[PDB]
Design goal:
Elements lengths: L1 E7 L4 E7 L3 H14 L5 E5 L4 E5 L1
Parallel strand pairs: 1-4
Antiparallel strand pairs: 1-2, 3-4
Length: 56
Amino acid sequence: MQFKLIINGKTLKGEITIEAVDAAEAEKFFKQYANDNGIDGEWTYDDATKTFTVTE
């Protein structure tokens, strides 16, 4: 299904969405994406909205 990452960063704000099978596979993608974009922060996951947040 569609998973969302809400980015509340020092440089980048925004929202990315991907298609993934599981919240676990979505997390691996999103950690790779945060890595790639120099984002290091506090994370949550909300199952109702299928949404991770990372906040710097």
